[PDB]
Design a binder for this molecule. Structure first.
Ligand code: HEM
Ligand code: HEM
Ligand code: HEM
Ligand code: HEM
Ligand SMILES: Fc1ccc2c(/C=C/c3nnn[nH]3)c[nH]c2c1
Ligand SMILES: Fc1ccc2c(/C=C/c3nnn[nH]3)c[nH]c2c1
Ligand SMILES: Fc1ccc2c(/C=C/c3nnn[nH]3)c[nH]c2c1
Ligand SMILES: C[C@](N)(Cc1c[nH]c2ccccc12)C(=O)O
Ligand SMILES: C[C@](N)(Cc1c[nH]c2ccccc12)C(=O)O
Ligand SMILES: C[C@](N)(Cc1c[nH]c2ccccc12)C(=O)O
Ligand SMILES: C[C@](N)(Cc1c[nH]c2ccccc12)C(=O)O
Lengths: 326, 343, 344, 344
């Protein structure tokens, strides 16, 4: 029957290590570490793509509508975070290579770099990094079937788009139902008004009431300083404020997980930068990838700006408590 | 021009994922995670073998004799423990797979397992796990699972000099052991004999806290003086409860007690690193067990639990040197001649 | 002057709690400072774990757990406990930067204190549900006064194991006149085994066939043992099992039907309880691995007693781990008809 | 006889938890986690200060001159980075608190913050963050009395940067009358660049060749700038550099000749100082990433983001030595006399 080595196709995995330094008759020991490290990163990127495409598909084929599938969705998105956490720790292995030892084989690599990682771009695109928000261009490095896959990843529905659609259908937003948005505007307005001192309040008032300016939201959307439809934003805040309601518990975990993935991607970018500095003394472009420009779910972070006292949150009457009960 | 994908042979690495569940028309999502996890472990085992063989070679060809090479030796052995640290953390990824989800594809894997990891055995053997000290699985040797060129490589790895043997040889040549030189072992026996005598006197100044100190002293005396019983050491060597030659043990303790001496600083770091590698291997074995329990309940789970013992710690002697630690003022002083040899 | 960082955090206490016994007897040893801070950091986190754990115990004990609105809070806090324990396992890495030789220079001045006298560690063991007669010999003698009194309360008050057990007994779907999970499961496993024995007895007499019969008979014994309530009571009294028969049924109900909305977060809770058992035993194991490096095969048996705490004798939720033994093909799990899909 | 609780002054450590929310009759559960987390950070800051002051002292009192002490110095500086690694991971515990739950007790804290952490500032100062490298938002104003006095001493007493600089200036091999590292290096880089210009001007006239000439001329300008002591003084005063020209020479001597016995542990020390800078900035970055989650864009979040720059890396010079790496065969060879000087 089946043998470990054959099951895992180790005849491919463990015969993929060719030191360019050796191939030009000057073998450098540490180049082996450089190769395995990248290969391990690429195995895990493939796994992240596998989880991510499976989750994209659960939204796209409508299975997400059946709430029995939310445990699967949150598990796999959580799994992506656990993988990314290891990829952040994995830099510690490559930091055991000194700049001097790297310098002895660096010449033999030119002009290859992570800029040519197909999977890293697929991953960025599939989460929902938009091309016009990227700092300088990126797809020039790719040709043939790879250039074609990269296009599909920009055109096919992103995780951001599929989550946006789902967030728009959040229960409680219906004006002739719970009418969350109307009640919230009323309750914040009635709050506030319950007002030589600081009089900072005017700052708080401007910020909170700006939430209800749909026009400001559309302007900021088109400048790419926000990413979610106004209606998706309402669903997210509905899930935040009413997270203890049974039907919102796992959805709240999902929103938390999406923010975790943004955090860990940017931590990956930051640990990469911190190491490129040590190796080369490039370094400036990477530093500019560590900004909110590249956080696909920045809207979910910025909802913290619009937190209010508990007693302002529109109360749930027995009818709507029962709608949000499994 | 060279291309990232081509440099890394990603045409092999990223086309090595075949789900047996899919191959029999019932694809299970989590089987993909099962495969990548093993492949990642196997890439890192290959890297550990690369570091380990490079270090074995530096001892075997005599380069280690030139002390300028100790930074390289300690860096690579330290690198091995950083990789093992990640491999211990890597179990956390496979723990995101539930036993229920694993159960949906387990059938399609039979009868393969990690028992057939060639690299894991090469790694155990090359560090210096002895075949006769291994726990048997279903009353058989671990090498039955392998045939042909793989069985042959495993044999070479048992017969070729292990890291334990090469470190032992190097430890035997440690400066300061020469009876007609510093004579570390003679001075130490004298100073421990004197130190114990001074301690007995301080105590024979009665109470019940005093009586519990006499019992403790008599225990400490028996243990410390047993160090100088070369006969007991040879007996324990042959029972495999110890691994290093008596002379290698002397070198190790020389490096421990005189670690601040310039020529002993990096050697001390190396001994610390060898213990780190033993600790992290056993942590790997323990995290593997803790997870097999969660996935299966059951014997596999019992044999693995028995691999988490001092039977499998190749450098157990370096841990057990802590038993024979003594107060600072007992350690034989270094006169200006021998300070200068180590500086 | 309103509120000040130092005052808010009572840093006048926290940062004036470091007294090196080596210094107090006129022979200051540098690394003793690290020994003290490391233990103090462990004890701050033990206090936090007790805070989360007592809050969760209380939500079960006062009946608030019955309102499923509260399960997000319960799973968050139990998850938080395992995140803290993960850091406590990593925290050993700091104390491993102390050599055995450096430890040996101040060890004398500590006698006869040890972690055996950690009140909070015992409170934590007791409150999760470590049972007194399953503790390895060479524990309460070390403690006196109001500490001895708190330890007693922790043994007498309802443990997390007891409170989870009670809640697991009320799991929906166990009612014989309802979904009748246990009856349907016995029927489906009994039928499934019968179908499998027939598929096997068809095969032409061989050696591969006989090794399948031996494998089948093993599987049959294990699965059908689930329905032996008497075996379960015997194993309960030997302390090889901890959950009531009915609590075991609820746990397996939640395992098999975890995707059902009402079971999703409860499944996460069961997962978290197993995580806490895993991380406690990892804490015990990393402690052992380090005591070996510091003391060798010397007393404090020491290194040997600790090694015996790293067993399933100390896993409070062993029953949750061992449910993996009784996993069955998917198509054997009793189907949910539209009526019971709607209840969950 | 000594008791665990008493040895560790747990009567202080575990009675330092006062929830302001409870003190104003509205107890919020998660405030307890907020307090323990900060107290654990502050215990570890105290330990880092203990290691750091002990190492400062070994330089300041001349013990560092005796190379017997390098193992101690590197162990303790390595210990600092292991502690900082845990402090970076420790953010994961506070990330188990949601912004909503934080918001329920945030009001009761005003206007206290980490800006009032005495130990964080002592730590920044003692490593060698200077006044003129700080982003402006007068950090000292928050402190009064004996705390203001400690902060002053930390600015005035010799920093780790100053003490390392002094030691690096005495590095063997820099003496013009001896190995004369700097002279030989200028000669070998000048010769090496000449050989390289020739190898390039030989190549078949092309566009790939012209892009190599532009690359060479860039590399030549950068390498030769190393020997411009005037450019170094200019960059020192603009705070783009921190180390004396002579200290920089010692560092590069240790980099290129690290395998020489007397340089092995010194190389580890330089590596460790870079590790400490990396982990401090990772601490600053994980703090920022979490303040974002808790507060949004409310400056605050913007000032912290500006602390995550090379302006706060005290040993940025040690990172930037990688800019001046050269092929192995250009490094001045060591004759038998100087091989013997760098032998323990
Ligand atoms: C010594 C180690 C490393 C150095 C010095 C290094 C250096 C760099 C530099 C300078 C860049 C900017 C592009 C360029 O100039 O070519 C870059 C980009 C990149 N590197 Fe690396 N790298 C290293 C390791 C890694 C590893 C292990 C990975 C894992 C796959 C990786 C993935 C990437 C990716 C994905 C990019 C594109 C980044 C983006 O566009 O956001 N690098 N690297
Ligand atoms: C769901 C995950 C896993 C399960 C259920 C599992 C199960 C087992 C079992 C039962 C054994 C004992 C031999 C046998 O009866 O099969 C074993 C041994 C082993 N497994 Fe795993 N394993 C898992 C994951 C891994 C992974 C990811 C590795 C990575 C290399 C691995 C490496 C090994 C090795 C090397 C052995 C032989 C160990 C020894 O003899 O000391 N396993 N495994
Ligand atoms: C150098 C470090 C350490 C050494 C050598 C050490 C040694 C020991 C020993 C020998 C015991 C068994 C009882 C005895 O003979 O006195 C013990 C128990 C214990 N230690 Fe430690 N220990 C260390 C660090 C720590 C730390 C940092 C903690 C943190 C709280 C800790 C907590 C405990 C606890 C709670 C016990 C009771 C264990 C049980 O019954 O399951 N130890 N330690
Ligand atoms: C929910 C958790 C936290 C929030 C929201 C938070 C927020 C902030 C903010 C806004 C500042 C800037 C000063 C101000 O405008 O008041 C700050 C600075 C600071 N925080 Fe935090 N913080 C948190 C947790 C922590 C923790 C756990 C520590 C642990 C010691 C800490 C240490 C500091 C330090 C030292 C500063 C001064 C930073 C500098 O000058 O570079 N913070 N924090
Ligand atoms: F490549 C492989 C193949 C099978 C297993 C395995 C199987 C364990 C097992 N349990 N029951 N049957 N096999 C554990 N790791 C593996 C790696
Ligand atoms: F607060 C304390 C005091 C002593 C110890 C200790 C002593 C262990 C020991 N080994 N040999 N003698 N004492 C281990 N953890 C501790 C914590
Ligand atoms: F002792 C304290 C008190 C408050 C804070 C804090 C508050 C930050 C903040 N932002 N908005 N309101 N409070 C961050 N670290 C702290 C330590
Ligand atoms: C029927 C539904 N599953 C409802 C839904 C939409 N968005 C949500 C967010 C949280 C909870 C629920 C929902 C659906 O429309 O998909
Ligand atoms: C010349 C020598 N390198 C000496 C040697 C042997 N073992 C040691 C331990 C520590 C320091 C040195 C040694 C050699 O014989 O290898
Ligand atoms: C009404 C109920 N909350 C029902 C209950 C008990 N255990 C469970 C496990 C999963 C889902 C639900 C339950 C109660 O009695 O607590
Ligand atoms: C005698 C000496 N320890 C020499 C010294 C200074 N900096 C160094 C760096 C590496 C090796 C040595 C040194 C001293 O002058 O302190």
């Amino acid at each position: 029957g089946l043998i470990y080595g054959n099951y895992l196709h180790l005849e491919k995995v463990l015969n993929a290590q060719e030191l360019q330094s050796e191939t030009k008759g000057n073998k450098i020991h540490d180049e082996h570490l450089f190769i395995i490290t990248h290969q391990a990163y690429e195995l895990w990127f493939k796994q992240i793509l596998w989880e991510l495409d499976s989750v994209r598909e659960i939204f796209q084929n409508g299975h997400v509508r059946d709430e029995r599938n939310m445990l699967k969705v949150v598990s796999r998105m959580h799994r992506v975070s656990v993988i990314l956490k290891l990829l952040v720790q994995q830099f510690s292995i490559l930091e055991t290579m000194t700049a001097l030892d790297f310098n002895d084989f660096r010449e033999y690599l030119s002009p290859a770099s992570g800029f040519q990682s197909l999977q890293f771009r697929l991953l960025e695109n599939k989460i929902g990094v938009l091309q016009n928000m990227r700092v300088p261009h990126y797809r020039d490095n790719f040709k043939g079937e790879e250039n074609e896959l990269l296009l599909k990843s920009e055109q096919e529905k992103t995780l951001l788009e599929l989550v946006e659609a789902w967030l728009e259908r959040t229960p409680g937003l219906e004006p002739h139902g719970f009418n969350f948005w109307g009640k919230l505007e009323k309750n914040i307005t009635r709050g506030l008004e319950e007002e030589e001192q600081v009089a900072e309040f005017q700052k708080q008032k401007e910020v909170l009431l700006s939430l209800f300016d749909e026009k400001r939201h559309e302007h900021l959307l088109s400048k790419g300083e926000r990413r979610l439809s106004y209606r998706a934003l309402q669903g997210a805040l509905m899930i935040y404020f009413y997270r203890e309601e049974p039907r919102f518990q796992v959805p709240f975990q999902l929103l938390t997980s999406l923010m975790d993935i943004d955090s860990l991607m940017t931590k990956w970018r930051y640990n990469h930068v911190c190491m490129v500095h040590r190796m080369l003394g490039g370094y400036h472009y990477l530093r500019s990838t560590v900004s909110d420009r590249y956080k696909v779910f920045v809207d979910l972070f910025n909802l913290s700006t619009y937190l209010i006292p508990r007693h302002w949150i529109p109360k749930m009457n027995p009818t709507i408590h029962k709608f949000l009960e499994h």
